[PDB]
């Protein structure tokens, strides 16, 4: 019925999680971007299959470049200096299917090498993880989605636990 922020709630191993989806706002990001300060982690999603898809429909903008630009803008905000990012590279089946039909070299002028999933994934990831510059305070966790099993929830739970532990140690001053 209502538009705007959508909230989903679930409990995993006695931890209560809250997730806010802000994709329906369609307004200036800066005005509402200072309201979300204080979150524990930021979940970020990227599709590998957009390398050879002109999703944007603009010749100048390729979906991968747009995703990289958005990730760069989000990661280096003044407010989110100390919030970690859980990066989810998604759709690894179709991407692996199309690599041999059209290699990864279309997106980047530099060669990925070998035209196969392991090498291609490494090049796309390294290129996404190098966008950050506050390496001292924030870190990125990367998981390739697995549909059948529950690796998706467990990875988020473990990442949140690690973030909480590292936050407490830093406050004590030990870390």
């Amino acid at each position: 019925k209502t538009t705007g922020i959508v909230e989903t709630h679930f409990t995993f191993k006695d931890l209560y999680f809250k997730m806010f989806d802000v994709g329906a706002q369609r307004s200036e990001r800066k005005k509402w971007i200072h309201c979300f300060e204080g979150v524990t982690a930021i979940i970020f999603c990227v599709a590998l299959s957009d390398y050879d898809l002109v999703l944007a429909e603009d010749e100048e903008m390729n979906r991968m470049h747009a995703s990289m630009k958005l990730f760069d803008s989000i990661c280096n905000n003044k407010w989110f200096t100390e919030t970690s990012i859980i990066l989810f590279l998604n759709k690894k089946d179709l991407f692996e299917e199309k690599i041999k039909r059209s290699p990864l070299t279309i997106c980047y002028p530099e060669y990925t090498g070998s035209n196969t999933y392991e090498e291609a994934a490494a090049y796309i990831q390294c290129q996404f993880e190098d966008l950050n510059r506050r390496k001292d305070t924030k870190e990125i966790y990367t998981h390739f989605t697995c549909s059948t099993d529950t690796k998706n929830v467990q990875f988020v739970f473990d990442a949140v636990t690690d973030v909480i532990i590292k936050n407490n140690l830093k406050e004590c001053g030990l870390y």
């Binding site: 209560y16 997730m19 979940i43 599709a47 979906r63």
Partner: protein, 45 residues
């Protein structure tokens, strides 16, 4: 009289405010970003 009623109402409001805040403090908040058609739907499901 009126001061007593106001004080009692304030103390009832304050007690409810404290406990609810303590309960909220025990939750983890996550922000889900992503351009549309990036598979956000699959993670949510």
């Amino acid at each position: 009289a009126e001061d007593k009623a106001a004080v009692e109402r304030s103390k009832m409001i304050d007690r409810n405010l404290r406990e609810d805040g303590e309960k909220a403090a025990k939750e983890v908040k996550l922000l889900l970003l992503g351009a549309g058609e990036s598979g956000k739907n699959t993670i949510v499901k």
